[PDB]
């Protein structure tokens, strides 16, 4: 499965739980693939109006993507994943024969 989130710690918890879950059952996972972090950055003027000094603040929305390819029956791995997630982690299907 492919895991996309805006909570690092939540993704990490999901990563460990599916890793343990799979390793019981001898399943073939290709070790946690961490994708380059994308940040959505917004550069915002402070003050709703002009007056006072020009003062800016720089906002960052950092999104985490992580990837695991897996060879098994879908249903058990998705069921293990789906119940174990917190909803802040968005789960997407990926599957292989080897």
């Amino acid at each position: 499965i492919a895991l996309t989130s805006k909570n690092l710690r939540a993704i990490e918890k999901v990563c460990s739980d599916i890793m343990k879950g799979a390793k019981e059952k001898n399943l073939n996972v290709s070790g946690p693939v961490r994708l380059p972090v994308k940040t959505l950055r917004i550069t915002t003027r402070k003050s709703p109006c002009g007056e006072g000094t020009n003062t800016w603040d720089r906002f960052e929305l950092r999104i985490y993507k992580r990837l695991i390819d897996l060879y098994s029956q879908c249903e058990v791995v998705t069921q293990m994943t789906s119940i174990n997630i917190d909803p802040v982690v968005e789960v997407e299907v990926i599957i292989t024969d080897s």
Binding site: K6, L40, I42, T44, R45, K46, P48, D57, R58, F59, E60, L61
Partner: protein, 48 residues
């Protein structure tokens, strides 16, 4: 009526209906002052 589907009068803030100061980056469609009230719960946190 005679609206246009382009240019300044075509669009307005999703929250407050101001025509000015709208963030269309990432298709947010919110004015920046309104955006400051919402900026933590949306996820656009400050850091550096």
């Amino acid at each position: 009526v005679h609206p246009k589907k382009y240019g300044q009068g075509s669009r307005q803030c999703r929250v407050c209906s101001n025509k000015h100061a709208i963030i269309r980056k990432y298709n947010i469609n919110i004015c920046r002052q309104c955006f400051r009230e919402r900026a933590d719960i949306i996820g656009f946190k400050k850091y550096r």
